[PDB]
Symmetry: C5
Subunit: 103 residues, 5 copies
């Protein structure tokens, strides 16, 4: 199994690493039908989403998507710095696949 977010990110297609090294600026959360999602933005404009579950995802991802959202909320509320993001870049805004935080 991978050691880093970078090797892990490298196993899928349509992905790339973003080096952020900054806390999240804004957090948006929606329960609107067909739009149950989460969106984060960074000071320099970058915007990422945690997509609404759907057919693209596998059953194992269902529990993982929920965990990712819980993660983004506590991180924002604590103003915790995000190191890197592994995002699928075939979606607008880009979709979050993995995240890392460094101390």
């Amino acid at each position: 199994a991978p050691q880093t977010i970078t090797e892990l990110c490298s196993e899928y297609r349509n992905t790339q690493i973003y080096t952020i090294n900054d806390k999240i600026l804004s957090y948006t959360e929606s329960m609107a039908g067909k739009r149950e999602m989460v969106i984060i933005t960074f000071k320099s404009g970058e915007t990422f989403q945690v997509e609404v579950p759907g057919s693209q995802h596998i059953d194992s991802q269902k529990k993982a998507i929920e965990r990712m959202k819980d993660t983004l909320r506590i991180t924002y509320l604590t103003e915790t710095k995000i190191d890197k993001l592994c995002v699928w870049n075939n979606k607008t805004p880009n979709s979050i696949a993995a995240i890392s935080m460094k101390n």
Copy 2:
């Protein structure tokens, strides 16, 4: 997908964006039968609710409703500032569709 709360809110009928820019003055949670809901209030005078789950909600939303409540709770205890809200105004008090916190 949408990139801001405003963009998202407009995809629905009967919604309106509210610019709070202040924390939740009041928080009410209820386990009472048929009133299993949350109510929040702002110093501005405005009150908002997270509806009792019902027939008007799609399955996708069932789980998002639970998260919104979790979120409002921590937001209130943390005294986190809310940026703006997207609410259905065909309900009283107005129903919460999405939320955004900034800075």
Copy 3:
């Protein structure tokens, strides 16, 4: 829908608003069979419970019950101050129906 706890509390018989204006003194949690419940007391000498799930509750309340417990735990933990509590007074100790915080 109600705009306030007083309002929601009034929709029930054997109900009563207690104006606390104080944080919790003690928190007791039990996982002993048939007594899976939480009890809280205050400096004023009052004691309330979040009842063990039973046939006195309709299905919609099951999720809400657990939530009340999560709310009460963290509230005690954060030394958060309670504003008011709507409770059913036909139980000993009085059973929590809803809670409000403010400030």
Copy 4:
């Protein structure tokens, strides 16, 4: 219903109250096969456990066990004072039936 932990404890056999009045010294968690449990010790040498879910446990407790582990985890992290513990003494280490905290 029971108004205090000492009252509650008294309803079962093979139980006894341990007045700790001290924060938790160590916290141990195992996700190992059939050793899915939590262990806590205090400076006064006493050690306790929240048991692996099993035959002794009725369906209702099942949810209770989980919550209990959640409580100990946060109690440890915030260094909050446990007042008393209602434990089953027919287990080694003694088994937690109910916890109590006071501030």
Copy 5:
């Protein structure tokens, strides 16, 4: 049941204790298909993971894996120090089987 992580660790084949005594340097989380895992790292360069739920786990382990992931996250965010950890050395990174915290 065991009373100490070490003792617990001995009960298993292919395990081994590592004395860390330090906080988590980095935390990585992935919701990508089949790589739904958590990876932790320390300043000494030690990397450990919480494996993807697979055929190697029994049903009771499934819930404990999720809890193991919650703990490492909050533990990281709170800058809490890990004392020891029992791991499976037949995987790369070594897989966490239990963790202990002190003081």
